[PDB]
């Protein structure tokens, strides 16, 4: 064996040619010993003696790609100051470029024995541990530019990478579930009849299947509990986990790429599969626990602002450096176009407060490489102050939380107030225009992977998610939803033709919005998870998609709703409309067909509006200053329980382009056109759209 | 005109083919505009109206480089709420790629009325202002190898621009003083015959002339005031200021990395040349007053740690995007192997305590272009808890002040300086050892820009600034230097031995010692200000270098050849510290009597000879192929006494290689043998050390 001191960056595994560079961080560690695994378990060890700034690094020649590593962090094991290193214990690589291997489940991944966690765990974790790998990082983007989709023509698609694609009638198994079969000409098309401009996958980054899943018959499926900040998930690769994933997530980049759809994966840096002080010692608690990790006050105990074991010490360099190195990592060797962050408050806590000024905030501002990619967040956390909907800095897009629940509540029959929901039309003007951003800063959404599918968002008024082991105390207990007449599946074809079209009028409120539309993956198949509103560990047909009449014309009336946003630049506007100085570019008006005043727009009881949206009005320039011209539109909502009667603004005539209200599809299909003061009697609960030539 | 919304990438206006695109950042900017400059003064404003997270941007087709521009920021001039903006005048672009002419000091570029404040100044400062010049980027930098010079192989050489090569017999009078000049082969030729690995160049980012300092027929020299951290400093360019001066310093650097030196630029990020208020109105004060720079608890006056008028807001990202887009500019863009951070401890200073973990910190430990360039700091600023010398992040290296006045003290003769003067030999263990670096990270040096010159240092014992105009009331008052017999020039042939032989010694203690050393420029042909101790206005015979024509080169001859020997050597520039102790000896106290040192005769009062041996069998340290590094065994002899005292050796034979005591210089001139137990009679303030492998 020979070692060379090597160099202390890049951080992780990287292979020179001749041999491979190993460089791992502790502050808090005496020895460090890199161990390379052989096909027989088998360490051989290395000491990384050479310590630079803290970081343990040799150059080892001849070791190559596919060699399964790992480290022992000889350090003291004292709970009590906060130091839980352990040298029985193979740590992983956080920045390891691929993982090989699964969790096996047992008492020796842990650090502490089974009943005294105050205690020193001396098993070998080796055989029951992931394996990080050492990666050929060659791969041949041939024309692969970055399809640098405007913000104001996105319309993103939430999907998950195995449910995607797992009952798809079109792929070979092996395909079916993994990276190259969201590659497949068969799924890009769909998502390209589909109009979607952006994937969003959820997370990628390899996660671990929670212990208390395992051993409870279930595994964790939708993945925010990842380990490896830099390597796909070995679980989605169907060319092997020996180096062989971050192939696959490559080239199904690639293909993604040559039809023009986006990649902005789904990234967790919240928390660690490590969980709390009962969690497993599988990466980070073994190389520095205090500098990863929040400790609370008793350093034994962590403190955990997202509900799920642990947190991330987001004023340490060590971890925003290996954040933003992954950040990086996906953006350049992996060429994801963007990135939506979960629970995107706890990155903000710098010392407890969601601080808007905070490191994490000023890293992400200023490097080039990932200011300029999507910056997508879920402007919340479970923590005290976490609700910070319209407080991230200006260079930020949310998840409009406030947009999901006013929309929601509007189509329930909730007596929330007009100008609530109106402000939502216009893109949370409330939110998002005081701070300096623009209505793209708004990620509408009607549903997503947490709670409800779109039609279980009409078919069901509380959870059922007893399937999940945890007796029905998961997940939102109240989605703010409405069963149509019947909690479950139904025969009867009045809440049927109500249901199916509710779930139009939740599209066509989406695609009218503005800002950038989100869709949960299967909404256009009318996919159902039976009420089941939290299907993290449901990786089962639960969560599938099922492909293959009814689940065909809401499909079409997706299809061509998306089509209209596309080609009228009204309803995705990229600025905010102001509708009256002291041809207007924005009016209200009553179903009686007169304006509306302050009065009616505080009305305690109403149900119903007529919104009329200029197009020679839209004060945008184009890409080359070009005045960007569109059709006029009148759009026609109705929240009554009850039939109620529209009158049109006289002389002139209209063309009713959108109708959530025939089971056939008005996008899809043609309009009878309508004159100035036509009286137009709309039915309950559903929608019509105008437009004037 | 033609002017499209263009991007908000980069800051800056960056050329693209067609023409350029302009972005400026401004949150308390009602309106920016965009000031395009013709040769006969007049403006083509054109409205930046796009705003992009509060960065104001046009792509203006056409514009190409040469375009002479600025801003115009109109803004609510309110220093009792922190603004500062004024349409009035024409703000530079503080991501200026080429700034071009000077300022022309008069009442229109103050912002206020000079009566008045807290009034509002209405004077066009066009035509008295710098202007920032839209460049071409292109460049062919050829072969450009960085020369990665290893850290314990560097010696940093301080140089000024002008000063190095305003005064050269060898180069045209055009390029004297200038970039160009300083790539002459003449030039790069004198630094390959010294030994040094890395030119640090003071100040090239452009600073503006004081008015304080034209105004009173000085001028601003060293350069530590600039308002554009992205462009050269013009009056350093032969070939013009209409971007011609980046051109300049490129093939200054190509030129350079061809020599391979490595061209270590100083940076001064703390504090602007718009000064507190009372100052002009140039750049950010314009632009967002508030956010860019530390205003007081009365947003009216400018907190000020650097006792330089101002202080910049370490905190507000748009500040630290800032100081990391010039940094990273630098490196990338003008292929500067790294950067000397002035007054340092104000950049860790994030809302008013010197933090460790400041966001600057975390921000350069983490950023892949930066981090790896050589990170310098002087550790210190004048505000509370301002001296942090071993303080900073283990990635850093720091000026050792505490070596400067230790070695300074020893040959002074001060009372009980051997014991530190041990630590300062060993790399300064009590600063650097337990925070996790190395010796290397102690910059060790005994002369700089600051205080005296190596000359001076050992010819005058206070200050002689009257030049400076302030009365001799500027500048360091004690340098702990002393004259040697008479305070200036002398005649005497006693003094002057003594002098020149003490110069020896300095230069001998700097490059025997751990860490890098540091030479300021012109110490070679001992170079000499006068007796100013604080040269920051001088520009002219006082600070520029003399270039030799017997003394002054006998005296070069012998820092050349010591250079040599700390590179031939690898003990003097050990890659880890000494331990001196098994419980091999790699280092060895003794005392001229020849017997080893003891802990009562090490804290002795009255102590001023030392005799170390270092071992060059024991140097316990990898090379890069995992080599053994090998070295004969050294034995210094450092007699600080005012007397000859009688030195013994230890333990065979021995060399002597270096002796300070004779004229004809014996770092070069080779040695007599001495036995290995005689007594040797060793001249007063002189040492000597011996060779055997
Ligand atoms: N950033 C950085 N700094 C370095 C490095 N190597 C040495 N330093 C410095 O070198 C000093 C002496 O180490 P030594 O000659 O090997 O003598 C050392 C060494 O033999 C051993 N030691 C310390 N750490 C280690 C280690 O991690 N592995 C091994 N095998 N020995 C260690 O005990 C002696 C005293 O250790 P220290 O208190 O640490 O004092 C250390 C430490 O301050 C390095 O690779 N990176
Ligand atoms: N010539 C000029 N006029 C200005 C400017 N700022 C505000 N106004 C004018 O005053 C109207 C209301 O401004 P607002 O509060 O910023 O409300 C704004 C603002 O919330 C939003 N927004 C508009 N433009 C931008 C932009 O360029 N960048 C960002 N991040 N947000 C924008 O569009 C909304 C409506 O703007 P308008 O339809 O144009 O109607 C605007 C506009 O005519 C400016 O910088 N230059």
Redesign the pocket.
């Known amino acids: 064996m020979q070692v060379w001191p090597g160099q202390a960056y890049p951080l992780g595994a990287t292979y020179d040619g001749a041999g491979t560079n190993f460089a791992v961080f502790s502050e808090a560690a005496h020895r460090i010993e890199l161990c390379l695994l052989h096909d027989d378990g088998s360490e051989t060890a290395v000491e990384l003696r050479e310590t630079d700034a803290f970081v343990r690094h040799a150059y080892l020649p001849g070791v190559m790609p596919g060699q399964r590593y790992g480290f022992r962090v000889h350090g003291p094991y004292a709970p009590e100051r906060g130091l839980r290193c352990n040298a029985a214990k193979l740590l992983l690589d956080p920045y390891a470029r691929a993982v090989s291997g699964r969790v096996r489940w047992g008492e020796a991944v842990y650090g502490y024995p089974f009943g005294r966690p105050d205690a020193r765990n001396d098993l070998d974790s080796a055989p029951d541990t992931m394996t990080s790998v050492v990666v050929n990082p060659y791969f041949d983007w041939g024309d692969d530019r970055r399809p640098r989709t405007e913000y104001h023509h996105t319309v993103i698609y939430e999907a998950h990478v195995k449910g995607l694609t797992m009952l798809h009638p079109d792929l070979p198994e092996e395909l079916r579930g993994t990276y190259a079969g969201l590659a497949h000409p068969s799924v890009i098309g769909h998502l390209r009849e589909l109009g979607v401009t952006a994937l969003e996958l959820m997370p990628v980054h390899q996660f671990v299947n929670d212990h208390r899943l395992v051993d409870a018959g279930l595994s964790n499926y939708w993945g925010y509990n990842t380990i490896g900040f830099f390597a796909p998930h070995n679980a989605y690769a169907s060319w092997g986990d020996r180096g062989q994933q971050v192939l696959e997530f490559k080239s199904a980049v690639r293909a993604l790429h040559q039809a023009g759809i986006e990649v902005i994966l789904d990234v967790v840096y919240n928390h660690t599969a490590e969980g709390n002080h009962l969690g497993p010692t599988l990466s980070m608690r073994g190389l520095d626990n205090p500098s990863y990790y929040r400790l609370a006050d008793d350093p034994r105990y962590y403190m955990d602002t997202t509900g799920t074991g642990n947190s991330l010490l987001m004023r340490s360099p060590h971890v925003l450096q290996l954040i933003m190195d992954s950040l990086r990592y996906w953006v350049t060797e992996m060429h994801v176009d963007g990135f939506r962050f979960d629970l995107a408050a706890t990155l903000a806590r710098q010392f407890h407060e969601v601080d808007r000024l905070s490191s994490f905030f000023d890293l992400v501002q200023q490097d080039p490489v990932v200011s300029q990619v999507k910056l997508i967040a879920e402007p919340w956390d479970v923590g005290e102050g976490g609700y910070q909907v319209g407080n991230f800095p200006?260079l930020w897009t949310e998840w409009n939380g406030k947009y999901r629940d006013c929309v929601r509540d509007l189509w329930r029959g909730e007596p929330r107030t007009l100008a609530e929901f109106a402000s939502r039309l216009t893109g949370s003007?409330d939110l998002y225009?005081d701070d300096?951003?623009?209505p793209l800063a708004s990620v509408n959404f009607v549903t997503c992977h947490d709670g409800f599918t779109l039609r279980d968002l009409v078919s069901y008024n509380e959870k059922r998610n007893e399937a999940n082991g945890e007796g029905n105390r998961d997940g939102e207990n109240y989605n703010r939803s409405w069963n149509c007449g019947e909690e479950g599946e139904t025969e009867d074809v009045g809440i049927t033709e109500l249901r199916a079209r509710q779930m139009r009028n939740f599209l066509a409120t989406l695609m009218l919005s503005q800002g950038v539309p989100m869709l949960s993956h299967g909404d256009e198949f009318g996919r159902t998870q039976g009420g089941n509103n939290n299907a993290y560990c449901q990786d089962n047909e639960v969560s599938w998609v099922r492909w293959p009449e009814a689940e065909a014309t809401l499909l079409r009336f997706t299809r061509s709703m998306v089509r209209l946003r596309r080609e009228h630049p009204v309803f995705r506007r990229?600025?905010?409309?102001?509708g009256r100085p002291v041809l207007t570019?924005i009016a209200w008006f009553t179903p009686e067909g007169e304006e509306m005043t302050s009065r009616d727009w505080q009305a305690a009881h109403a149900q119903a509006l007529t919104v009329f949206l200029n197009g020679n009005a839209i004060?945008?320039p184009g890409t080359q200053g070009e005045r960007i011209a569109d059709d006029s539109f009148l759009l026609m909502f109705n929240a009554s329980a009850k039939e109620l009667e529209f009158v049109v603004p006289h002389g002139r005539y209209w063309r009713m382009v959108v109708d959530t209200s025939d089971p056939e599809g008005m996008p899809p299909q043609q309009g009878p056109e309508l004159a100035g003061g036509e009286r137009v009697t709309l039915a309950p609960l559903s929608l019509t759209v105008l437009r004037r030539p």
Do not use: I, L, T, V
């Open positions: 200006p003007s225009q300096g951003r623009r990229r600025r905010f409309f102001h570019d004060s945008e």
